[PDB]
Structure 1
């Protein structure tokens, strides 16, 4: 099953920069969301969950078809809370009705990372909406109560290696767990709407205690008021992941570069880009544009 990228008719970099900008301006405006975290983190998570249903074995799921717009995927228990990101994007899509759903969901993630002072993430257009019956079934997104061997095997299905996995998990600097969505509660760190390598620093430097939360699930908690999921903590339990956590804790630029590559790859899995497709776009931030 081949998904060939097909550029929205007549569109070029400037059209997508306008979409970026609209997302970015709304992120600035709607700053009160989630006790003033803002929408950056949930948009990053929406981009990831809409891409992370991919199965390399048969090219089902993935970002291309924008299938989160259908009830089976939007109602996935694993996607609880992402409705907020979708609602954010609704007025964006109304203003730019020509962008595909998959391009919008993925671009929302890129925009959020960059506006939150993260790395530049090159982004390619040309995802095409596919019909309801192409929506992947629930259950392809990961469980949080598991160990490093689970994490490693899970991400093989997404064609991600150890370094790509550890880099992608650094997105957990952002936002928080919310008990009613996932059965976990609390932020991973202090700077939870600015993209930094704080996740790795907190894993290595906080004093974590294994506790039960009010949903009766185990999570790791610190006296600073931070938490880690069992799957997060697995990155310092496994000696191969641990080495990479230490690397990113000690090298902000390396983390940024590796994250950018892995995140673009996640957002592009399953898509065939023709030879003569446009090169990936690197959007300017609002700040870079003086906006």
Structure 2
């Protein structure tokens, strides 16, 4: 039997405590509005949560969000994580304000807060991740390659126990922010609204005119007449006929896309964690806007 990670709620903490940590991330998001040319820290926090979760292997329960291992040099220096140090740095003063929260809880809560605060769906979220030692840090190379096709994508995500719908849903996070040539070898915004969470990823894939080109690091990307880009793995969602059908469904139903993404994103952030029968129910946090804050 693989490793077992039992959710253990930070001693004495309840929903109100975590709503505070959320509110502090949310306030700071509002505050550092100007970053990445007025994109903000929203997207990088969404990406930080996915990457700290996306090391999971279903086969042996190694990696995943539970251990908060990104805080160790091997994981924070992962070439795939280039840039994410900004997300870490952003969450640093949050963690000094709320030092009782585990690292895994913080990184994953950062992703939740970012989505909700960019007008994304509500993402139920559970506390109880527990910091694990350095020797538990997963090796580099577990996050995906961008220069690949649909067959790669489908296989890759099987290791995260994600099916076709879950893959297409999670990839709509590429409505957010942009690629940076210095970080990934790709350059450009994915779409128009860079820090507002919509189903624009699917609509753009279908409606724009894309042209495959070599960028300034000699990597291939799909470039639109409108000035957007897609990764080869992004564009594969319309080259594969099963993916294409789901792309069309999300392009044509914002509510279903929100619903599906919420489920898949909670699932991604919870993979590898055992929650006790007596654990609290997932928390649905209020936005600042819903609190009047």
- The TM-score normalised by the length of structure 1 is 1.00
Q: Which residue of 2 aligns with 1:220?
A: 222
The residue aligned with 2:11 is: 9
> How big is each residue's C-alpha offset from its partner over 1:140-195, in whole Å with a ceiling of 9 and x where there is no partner?
00000000000000000000000000000000000000000000000111011000
Q: Partner of 1:44: helix, strand, or coil?
A: helix
- Measured after TM superposition, the shift of residue 262 of structure 1 is 0.1
1:129 corresponds, among 126, 131, 141, to 131
Per-residue CA deviation, residues 33-72 of structure 1 (Å, 9 max, x unaligned), is: 1011000000000000000000000000000000000000
- Supply the distance in 1 between the matched residues of 2:243 and 2:18 (Cα, whole angstroms): 36
Distance of 1:26 and 1:250 partners within structure 2: 34
Q: Offset at 1:223?
A: 1.2
- How far, CA to CA, are the matches of 2:93 and 2:35 in structure 1? 16
1:243 positional shift: 0.1
CA distance in 2, matches of 1:36, 1:134: 37
> How far 1:271 moved relative to its partner?
0.1
1:190-214 per-residue CA deviation (whole Å, 9 max, x = no partner) reads 0110000000000000000000100
Structure 1: gaps of 5 or more residues: none
Shift of 1:104: 0.1
Distance of 1:53 and 1:123 partners within structure 2: 19
Deviation beyond 2 Å, 4+ runs, structure 1: none
Q: For 1:55, which of 54, 57, 77 is the aligned residue?
A: 57
* Deviation of 1:248 (Å): 0.1
Give CA-to-partner distance per residue, 1:197-252, whole Å, 9 cap, x none: 00000000000000010000010001111000000000000000000000000000
For residue 271 of structure 1, give the secondary structure of its aligned residue in structure 2: coil
Aligned pairs for 1:1-291 within 5 A? 1-291=3-293
Kindly provide the CA deviation profile for residues 249-284 of structure 1, in whole angstroms up to 9, marking residues without a partner as x.
000000000000000000000000000000000000
Q: How far is 1:287 from its partner?
A: 0.1
Take 2:147 and 2:188, find their aligned partners in 1: how far apart are those partners? Answer: 15
* Counterparts of 1:261 and 1:113, CA distance in 2: 13
What is the Cα deviation at residue 123 of structure 1? 0.1
Once the two structures are TM-superposed, the CA of residue 134 in structure 1 deviates from its matched residue by: 0.1
Unaligned runs of 5+ in 2: none
- Secondary structure at the counterpart of residue 40 of structure 2: coil
Length, aligned pairs only: 291
- Counterparts of 2:62 and 2:222 in 1: how far apart (Å)? 34
**Inter-partner Cα distance in structure 2 for 1:177 and 1:99:** 30
**Root-mean-square deviation (CA), in Å?**
0.3
TM-aligned CA deviation for residue 286 of structure 1? 0.1
TM-score by length of 2: 0.99
